[PDB]
Amino acid sequence: RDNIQGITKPAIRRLARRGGVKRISGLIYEETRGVLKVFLENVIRDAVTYTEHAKRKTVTAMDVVYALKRQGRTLYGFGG
Amino acid sequence: RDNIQGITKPAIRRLARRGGVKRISGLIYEETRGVLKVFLENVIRDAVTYTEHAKRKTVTAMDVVYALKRQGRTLYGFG
Amino acid sequence: PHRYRPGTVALREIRRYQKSTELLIRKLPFQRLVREIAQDFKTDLRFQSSAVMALQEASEAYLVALFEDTNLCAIHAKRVTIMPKDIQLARRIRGERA
Amino acid sequence: CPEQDKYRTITGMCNNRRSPTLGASNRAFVRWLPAEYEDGFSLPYGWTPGVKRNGFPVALARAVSNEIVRFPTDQLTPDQERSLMFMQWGQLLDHDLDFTPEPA
Amino acid sequence: CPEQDKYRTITGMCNNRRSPTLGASNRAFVRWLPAEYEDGFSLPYGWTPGVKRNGFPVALARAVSNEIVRFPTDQLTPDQERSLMFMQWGQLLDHDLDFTPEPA
Amino acid sequence: KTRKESYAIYVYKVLKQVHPDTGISSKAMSIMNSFVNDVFERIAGEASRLAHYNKRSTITSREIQTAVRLLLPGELAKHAVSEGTKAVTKYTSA
Amino acid sequence: VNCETSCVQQPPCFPLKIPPNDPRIKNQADCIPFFRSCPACPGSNITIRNQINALTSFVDASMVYGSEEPLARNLRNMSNQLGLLAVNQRFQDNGRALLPFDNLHDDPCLLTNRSARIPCFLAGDTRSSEMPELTSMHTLLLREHNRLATELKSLNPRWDGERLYQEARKIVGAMVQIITYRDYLPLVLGPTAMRKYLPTYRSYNDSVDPRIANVFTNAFRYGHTLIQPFMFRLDNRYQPMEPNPRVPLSRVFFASWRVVLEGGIDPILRGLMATPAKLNRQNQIAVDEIRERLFEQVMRIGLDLPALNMQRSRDHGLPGYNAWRRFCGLPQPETVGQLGTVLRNLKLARKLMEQYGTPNNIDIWMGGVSEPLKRKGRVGPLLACIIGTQFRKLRDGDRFWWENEGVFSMQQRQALAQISLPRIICDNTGITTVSKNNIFMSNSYPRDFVNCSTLPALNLASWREA
Amino acid sequence: RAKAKTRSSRAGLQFPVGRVHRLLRKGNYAERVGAGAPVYLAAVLEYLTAEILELAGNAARDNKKTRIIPRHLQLAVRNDEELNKLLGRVTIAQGGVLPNIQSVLLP
Ligand SMILES: *[C@@H]1O[C@H](CO[C@@H]2O[C@@H](C)[C@@H](O)[C@@H](O)[C@@H]2O)[C@@H](O[C@@H]2O[C@H](CO)[C@@H](O[C@@H]3O[C@H](CO[C@H]4O[C@H](CO)[C@@H](O)[C@H](O)[C@@H]4O)[C@@H](O)[C@H](O[C@H]4O[C@H](CO)[C@@H](O)[C@H](O)[C@@H]4O)[C@@H]3O)[C@H](O)[C@H]2NC(C)=O)[C@H](O)[C@H]1NC(C)=O
Ligand code: HEM
Ligand code: HEM
Ligand SMILES: *[C@@H]1O[C@H](CO)[C@@H](O)[C@H](O)[C@H]1NC(C)=O
Numbered sequence A: 001r002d003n004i005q006g007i008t009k010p011a012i013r014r015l016a017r018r019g020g021v022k023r024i025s026g027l028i029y030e031e032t033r034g035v036l037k038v039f040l041e042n043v044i045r046d047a048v049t050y051t052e053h054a055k056r057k058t059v060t061a062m063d064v065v066y067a068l069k070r071q072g073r074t075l076y077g078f079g080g
Numbered sequence B: 001r002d003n004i005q006g007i008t009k010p011a012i013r014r015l016a017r018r019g020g021v022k023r024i025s026g027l028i029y030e031e032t033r034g035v036l037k038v039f040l041e042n043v044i045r046d047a048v049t050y051t052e053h054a055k056r057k058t059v060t061a062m063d064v065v066y067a068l069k070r071q072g073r074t075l076y077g078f079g
Numbered sequence C: 001p002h003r004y005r006p007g008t009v010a011l012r013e014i015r016r017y018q019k020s021t022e023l024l025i026r027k028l029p030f031q032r033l034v035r036e037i038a039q040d041f042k043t044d045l046r047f048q049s050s051a052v053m054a055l056q057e058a059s060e061a062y063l064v065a066l067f068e069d070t071n072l073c074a075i076h077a078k079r080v081t082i083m084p085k086d087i088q089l090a091r092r093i094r095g096e097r098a
Numbered sequence D, E: 001c002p003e004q005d006k007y008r009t010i011t012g013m014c015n016n017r018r019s020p021t022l023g024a025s026n027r028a029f030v031r032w033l034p035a036e037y038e039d040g041f042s043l044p045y046g047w048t049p050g051v052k053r054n055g056f057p058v059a060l061a062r063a064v065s066n067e068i069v070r071f072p073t074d075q076l077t078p079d080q081e082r083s084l085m086f087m088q089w090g091q092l093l094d095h096d097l098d099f100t101p102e103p104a
Numbered sequence F: 001k002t003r004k005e006s007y008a009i010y011v012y013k014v015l016k017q018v019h020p021d022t023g024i025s026s027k028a029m030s031i032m033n034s035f036v037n038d039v040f041e042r043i044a045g046e047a048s049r050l051a052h053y054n055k056r057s058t059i060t061s062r063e064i065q066t067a068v069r070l071l072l073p074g075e076l077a078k079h080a081v082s083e084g085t086k087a088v089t090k091y092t093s094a
Numbered sequence G: 001v002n003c004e005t006s007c008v009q010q011p012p013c014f015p016l017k018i019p020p021n022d023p024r025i026k027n028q029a030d031c032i033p034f035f036r037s038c039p040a041c042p043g044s045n046i047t048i049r050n051q052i053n054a055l056t057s058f059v060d061a062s063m064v065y066g067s068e069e070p071l072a073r074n075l076r077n078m079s080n081q082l083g084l085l086a087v088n089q090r091f092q093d094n095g096r097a098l099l100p101f102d103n104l105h106d107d108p109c110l111l112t113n114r115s116a117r118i119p120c121f122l123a124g125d126t127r128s129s130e131m132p133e134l135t136s137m138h139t140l141l142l143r144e145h146n147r148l149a150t151e152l153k154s155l156n157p158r159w160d161g162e163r164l165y166q167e168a169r170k171i172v173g174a175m176v177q178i179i180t181y182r183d184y185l186p187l188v189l190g191p192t193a194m195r196k197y198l199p200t201y202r203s204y205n206d207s208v209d210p211r212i213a214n215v216f217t218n219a220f221r222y223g224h225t226l227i228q229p230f231m232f233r234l235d236n237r238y239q240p241m242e243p244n245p246r247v248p249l250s251r252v253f254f255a256s257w258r259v260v261l262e263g264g265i266d267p268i269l270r271g272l273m274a275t276p277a278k279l280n281r282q283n284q285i286a287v288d289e290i291r292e293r294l295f296e297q298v299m300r301i302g303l304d305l306p307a308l309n310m311q312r313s314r315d316h317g318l319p320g321y322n323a324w325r326r327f328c329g330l331p332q333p334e335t336v337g338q339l340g341t342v343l344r345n346l347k348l349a350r351k352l353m354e355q356y357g358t359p360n361n362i363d364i365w366m367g368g369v370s371e372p373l374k375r376k377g378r379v380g381p382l383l384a385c386i387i388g389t390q391f392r393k394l395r396d397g398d399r400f401w402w403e404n405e406g407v408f409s410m411q412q413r414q415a416l417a418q419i420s421l422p423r424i425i426c427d428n429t430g431i432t433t434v435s436k437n438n439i440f441m442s443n444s445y446p447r448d449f450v451n452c453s454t455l456p457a458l459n460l461a462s463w464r465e466a
Numbered sequence H: 001r002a003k004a005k006t007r008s009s010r011a012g013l014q015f016p017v018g019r020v021h022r023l024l025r026k027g028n029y030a031e032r033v034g035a036g037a038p039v040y041l042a043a044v045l046e047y048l049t050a051e052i053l054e055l056a057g058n059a060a061r062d063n064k065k066t067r068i069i070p071r072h073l074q075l076a077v078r079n080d081e082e083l084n085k086l087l088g089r090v091t092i093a094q095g096g097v098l099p100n101i102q103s104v105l106l107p
């Protein structure tokens, strides 16, 4: 159940490289994992609330889109 | 019409002191004046648009409140 | 010839202005600036006093928050002096100039 | 204290693995403020007659109950937002939490 | 104890008028954190061999002193901004403040 | 003179419920009215969007409860939900 | 030096002296019996006197299972391997379980009825035999544990007696915690104090001290202001139950024969559910049943419960009202005007000033119950602060908290979230009409009463092991 | 007819259930509005108002003041984590700022 370690150090390094980072400290990975967990917790909580209001057991992509729009992170290309 | 200089250096210093700033460089005042001018330009443009839509020649407090709320800067105390 | 240290009066002002609720900008110059700026959008404009007061309050709050962020940026760079690059970095990260 | 346990102990021990006696039974209370006795450590206020508390005489508890607590029963005010279940569960929870033994 | 005083009591009694014991001599220490004993209340860690603290064996104090504290004396460096008066006054103040008795 | 309605009487009643002796000023009333209007608008808009998403033409207590859960943070949402549920149950009983 | 019969102030006796012109006691030579609490370690002139807590501070239903190993072993049914608790071997409540009888040398239970000869009951706490409502609670929890063990034995035939007992005890403790922290404390403290002192649960601090504060044992006695002067019994239609529908409280103390021979615990539970409590007003604090006639039948003279509370606070050496106001971060009044402003009742401030002389000398219980109640609450700011702090420490400092990870599974936690005291009453008694949600608020029949069948039941399928 | 009884009195509230219902009906939120929605909304509004007013009154008492001014409202909002999160992008007029000086700037 320790799936937060599934976001490996090379993946975080790749994400930093896409962001234009040349050198990465060794303690960056834990901070990135914590930030990702917090963001995912917020978005997934909103999506699960939307799903529960609809009396559904399956979380759809449209619920995730609504959650992201609620946080102010409108996402294009998934759903509509 | 040079009224941006009406926001004097002591006023900017006071605003920084309220923000917890201890030491201020000499070139900060011009940057603060520019930032204030940009912010006021945006807010006043939105308020004047709201006023023109209402067919009025007077800018009211409600127009400014709506202009600020449109920018995610909700202001409490004027309606 | 009692002269305070170059940091004592600054801290005294910080403590004084963080405990008050007044407006730190003179009202008449700000009103003149607001009218001059509004002259660029519509000629022959009239302003309610409450409108100018609301604009002043919003501007002062925005500047205070920006200066707090700028102080954080300056402290990050191992400094106590507030510099324009700190303001620019804060505005970029906030999303204004970005 | 065992390294692994699935259930509580009856005596309440080993709940806090650093200080196992925290919360266990037959242990002294925790004082949030220093105690205030007549002589400082053991004698309660009102034990020795003529000794004042903070420059004022100590009022008898029965006298305080007579003057302040006493009120006519017929003027009782019912509670329209609470039931006797509230009070009964309060007493049950109190008997769950604390009990101060006295000599027989 | 007297309501009005001009000098300290040699024992420290009634310095705090609400709780006279506070600060007096021959009194127990205050606990900022709960005690952590081997058996919970009285036995120190390292008393009975084979008992581990926080899942780890208890290190001998002499072994820790030998490994970490020890250093060659000739490599001593002096403090340019302090004198032995500093540590002597520290010891004098410590002897002013506290002293834990031990049995004869 | 037209009649302008505001949440001043009700805010004063709540204040006297909480602080019978403490009074309020005019600017504090203005801020209270603005805050009440803003929260009302936020909750109503969230409930309307919830109703539109599920293809419903009616705003019910469920939509308001879900909007409260979505907007209000932490224990505020739980306490507000409990208060609203109690009020709705009391109204249904009476 | 017997304190119950002698008024000489010799340890451990600390008798209450009778003021002149007492309405009830006309002889000043008499006194109210009183026993000093046992010191933490007797005879020590070095340590400040401290009192002993004889029960586990955690909310673990120690009133049902006990806090000592011999008593806990004696409370169980060792004649089998179903992990049940001991029940009465002589009487039954309409075919349902009853608490076992307890053998003490000086039993006050037979003093109330010398004809019934029904002794006191045996439970996890020795105070369970006061008063039929508490005995009804203890019997209900006993029946609930037995039913839970029976259902678990049905689900898992491989489990032994010890496993059944431990699992049923775990479920009962989790139920008690849920009911306490979800239904009771919000009504006690109020939403403001509940949110201020009991925030959202996060995880298990091992650094939080879970011990019970000395002041808490006297601050939680605010419930003495909610006590009604009568015991009410209702029949199946929630009507007064003849004979004796309303019995004075002075005739129910230590009266287990009422529980045994007078229809069991169903009428008592119905009366608890369908009767309003007593409101705490600054001019109506405590009734005369507990103030003039407490334990009248089993004692040589009636006791005074508020006077006992304040004498116990003095015995425990607790600080005054101002010290605790300072402790909780509240302003401390100094004059009669400041005290009147704080209390919102000027006449009460004059009375308190006359009795004590300074706000610093006001006893903790008196000042706590004299304060105006919080909005949607039943305690003052000081009492709310103390109670909220104590329960926050008891919640965060408990390793076996039901919400703590590893204690219950996620499915088990969700199943436990559906429990309710109304459902327990429906399951473990013959009551078919039961009050709605927040049983501590519904008090008027039949406006806030529903049928027992509409209550969702606890689904134990998540406890099946495979 | 029978004597009129306000819906707020029936629900045990002090905020106007009828006014909230009218605002919901005329606010262009949905085609229809249920009968229990105004009660829930009024209860939530009353709870939030009571929370903020209680905190502001406590702040005013801490300052030895009898009346609540916008400074007390700002102190109440900014000192509460959940209220600060709710009113994060909200400016309160004449509210000032929380007294806070960075540690590194201290002598
Ligand atoms: C004279 O000093 C008094 C004591 O001073 C202490 O020692 C000195 C040397 C300093 O270090 C000082 O900071 C120490 O407090 C002082 O009275 C003190 O006042 C404070 C602030 O009001 C009180 O703290 C409050 O206590 C309660 C309970 O919380 C405490 O106790 C529980 C149980 O032990 C713990 O779990 C807590 O962590 C705390 O230890 C609360 O009411 C409160 O916290 C809540 O409230 C505040 C605002 O109301 C919020 O910010 C918090 O988040 C909480 O919601 C405070 O923690 C302190 O108890 C009290 N001490 C004593 C001994 O009574 C006094 O002010 C000084 N006099 C003058 C004139 O300056
Ligand atoms: C010539 C100097 C010193 C001598 C002979 C000395 C020796 C000792 C000894 C034998 C003990 C008791 C050992 C124990 O209980 O474990 C002790 C404890 C202690 N020392 Fe020192 N030490 C010296 C310097 C200092 C200094 C410089 C300080 C502080 C600045 C200090 C502070 C203390 C304190 C507070 C104690 C606690 C008393 C106790 O444990 O009973 N000492 N010292
Ligand atoms: C039939 C009901 C009750 C009886 C017989 C009773 C009687 C007593 C007596 C005689 C004491 C010892 C002296 C003292 O009051 O400090 C006591 C203590 C106590 N009471 Fe009550 N009271 C009752 C109701 C309540 C209620 C409703 C509550 C709480 C909601 C409560 C809470 C307490 C607590 C926590 C103690 C401390 C235990 C101790 O000191 O031994 N009681 N009770
Ligand atoms: C133990 O349980 C059995 C049924 O399994 C019951 O008949 C018996 O009376 C119980 N014994 C005691 C002492 O409660």
Ligand SMILES: *[C@@H]1O[C@H](CO)[C@@H](O)[C@H](O)[C@H]1NC(C)=O
Pocket: G113, G114, G115, G116, G257, G261
């Ligand atoms: C004592 O109990 C008996 C039943 O055993 C009952 O008839 C009698 O009335 C009781 N006495 C009193 C005084 O209640």
Ligand SMILES: [Ca+2]
Pocket: D096, D097, G055, G056, G057, G058, G059, G060, G061, G062, G063
């Ligand atoms: Ca317990």
Ligand SMILES: [Cl-]
Pocket: D030, D031, D032, D033, G213, G214, G215, G216
């Ligand atoms: Cl204490």
